[model samples]
Target chain A: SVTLQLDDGSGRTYQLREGSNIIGRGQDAQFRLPDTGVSRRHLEIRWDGQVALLADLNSTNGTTVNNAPVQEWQLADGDVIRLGHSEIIVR
Target chain B: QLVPGARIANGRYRLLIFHGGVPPLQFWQALDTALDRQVALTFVDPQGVLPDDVLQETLSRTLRLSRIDKPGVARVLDVVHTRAGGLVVAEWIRGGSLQEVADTSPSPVGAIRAMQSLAAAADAAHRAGVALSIDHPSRVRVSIDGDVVLAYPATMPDANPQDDIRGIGASLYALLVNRWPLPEAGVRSGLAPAERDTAGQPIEPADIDRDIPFQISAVAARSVQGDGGIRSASTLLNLMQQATAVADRTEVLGPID
Candidate 1:
């Protein structure tokens, strides 16, 4: 499971299930953050039974794992996912 | 190069091939006996020594050419998919291509004039529901009296009119800088150090020559780099037309400082 916190003084928790969780501005996305920098289908989290993997969809602003741009990164508990101005917390 | 007497479609059209694209993709002059008029034939070898997507691309070009008919456009007379390859027969303009003219005249004014003609022609094609390839200079033909002809009706695969507009920008850059941003090799290694981005891609029209008018330069930069305002060829054409007007006015007014 994971929780995404918006820096706009509001904290929202999104439960990440075992599958592909898409994060973007599109309404069909699992976690939709409607920011101008956010692409239609920006970042994706592929959760296997063992671990969660973060993959950037070659986004416009880009996705970073701990301030460093990454193509794919293995997620640990409490690892931060930075997508443009938005942030996601994996738990 | 096609021999003068070579023929296609069972000698119905006699080949008058010229210097153009390398093997596989070629543009040559031909005669259509059925219409009894000179025509341009674009030959594509979709089966041999080409990308796997060539078949789909030829079909897309055929579909684009079927619906296009405009003055500035070199109308496609017929499209034939034979066992050998794909062939597109189009109207042949007698004059040389834009590249040939640009090679002869390396002046800034000449570049702007060429860009104006290309943009206007692309706009006309777009209005007629067609997207012409404005990327390479060979894709445009210039008549003796300065009339522009879109040599080909189809753009690159999966490209829209916006890409055509960008091609015009790249074309202008080629004129002023004496180099091609989108070179034929599909490589940016030929560009100077200052003109390319970190990824080795040519940056916007930042290297425009000083002799080029400021408005014209701005228009070229916007078109090539794809500004928010110039989304379509028609929009870019309007902007270029206005830029030419401003340049003309400046020539008379001599700087408004």
Candidate 2:
């Protein structure tokens, strides 16, 4: 199971099973976070054709993606996400 | 050096098709002849490769071509080439697509047609993987393997990061849909509804929704001097937030009056 803790620090956990858009095998696609009534763009933990997790700034609220608000960033398993002072992680 | 499966730096790739996951309702289409074919879509510069010499002449004839100028196109070119992600096409392709449609036929024919053509062009660049509608501009549509996927808009006004021009475009496109039909008058409803009072009686018109959230100012307020304003990234975030909020509220509160 993968857990996503939003910037606000509240967390919503999901089952990381296979063959599911919610938790599938393929990478590049980010899992949709619980809608916070604020951002339609969800936090994405992409497996961008690589072994490590790739943080993609491909959303409206735009996650830091990689390199602290930079480009094509590689993310750790327990990385901190900041959105207007909220920090969350997926485990 | 070949970066296996790596997207080439200055490769001149051709986008052949797009799929909206639907059957036979061409969302967007524009032949390669319609777009510049000689340009090499480079990673650092997009506008540098202009293949179609007649793009200007053809664009003049295309229906409803909006505020696109040479300079504006240049800035957009900068963004497209410089931006790390998202596919950038220097050549010609069709555009105009919506997130969803009531029937595909004519619900939004013009936009749909444009999207299909754009998608087909983008596809030429990527193989083995499916091209997502979101990865490209939302305003264009593509036809791939007989399926059509509507694309997003990535033009001057929309391409600009300073204004919510793209957001406004998406909203207007959705509003133009035939889903929300105006109710006819004469049922003796006291207030008579807004559209009814405007034209009066039997409502001799098609499906329409007057309350669609839109801002003509954002779209038409571009600078006349060619300094097209930038849309805040925050604005995009805000727009998405609002839209999502509305959808959530509707689900909880029931149809929007």
Candidate 3:
């Protein structure tokens, strides 16, 4: 599952198992998986000039942001990340 | 007592920010002459962490702000000045090198972001009626793992010169360390402090902080209100020391050179 730690006391987590994919801002990332699982974990991200990346925690398996595995991801305001559980959100 | 009667002239203040690179003695002298006041001196490590010397100097009148500038000093990004001198920020932040990772790696992306971030900060300062300007908008180039991955050339090529007084000293030091070219931008870079976006009403520095201690009341300074007095070499030395003390209180960035 991927979770975001926000400064404003509000956050969300997204979980993934295996066949899930999500895209990123612009054409930086193209997530394509054979099967996409739907996880309920969501991470709320914020943008303060710099991008805010969230980490997937590598839950049951692994999570990738901008194509890199991360314990914590730097999330920006409008970043499209795939939750291994098969879900994508942009807030 | 930096400037005399600095509380009545109503003269606006402009902030000239320099980071990574140092300034030449001649440039400092010229600014002292032009602004007719003093400039604060603060020092810190390349990482922006304040050091020991900074604290000690703070006890005195010096306000020296220093950051370690090695062969690779990140370029300065922004200068946000409030009526009372708000924040002067630089975004280029270098990271730690892994023992396994050679000194050569990709220049951190934060560095570039930090540089661009300054432009917006400058605009913010100006819009708030504060005098804020950036000189040599681009003069940072970082080679990652021996590869030229980032290059921030001087935006004003024509404005740039071999005898740039503002940063000659620092540029010379860079040349000594990395064999870079000697710049020629002279005393002033002719950069303007963009005004704030106050509904077409040009804001004044005083409009931001009516009670800030930034005002100098010395006799030498012209009788201007909301004016910032650029310090003398000696006064700057003293103020630099004072900055060190402030850092100590806040545990901010460092002991300077």
Query: Model 2's DockQ?
Result: 0.02
Output the number of the TM-score-best candidate: 1
Q: Point out where model 2 deviates above 4 Å.
A: A7-9, A15-43, A47-52, A58-62, A65-67, B1-176, B179-183, B187-257
Best-first order by lDDT: 1, 2, 3
Per-residue C-alpha lDDT of model 1 across residues B148-170, encoded as one tens digit per residue = 67665444465568878877777
lDDT of 2 by residue, B11-80 (tens): 3333233322111111122223333442212121123343233332222222112223221111122113
Question: Number of backbone collisions per candidate, in order?
Answer: 0, 54, 91
Interface RMSD of 3: 22.0
Clashing pairs in 1: none
Q: Superposing all C-alpha atoms, what RMSD in Å does each candidate have to the true structure?
A: 18.5, 20.9, 21.6
Error of 2 at B92 (Å): 45
For model 2, what is the alpha-carbon lDDT of residue B228? 44
Tell me the deviation in Å of residue A64 in model 3.
Answer: 12
Model 1, DockQ value? 0.01
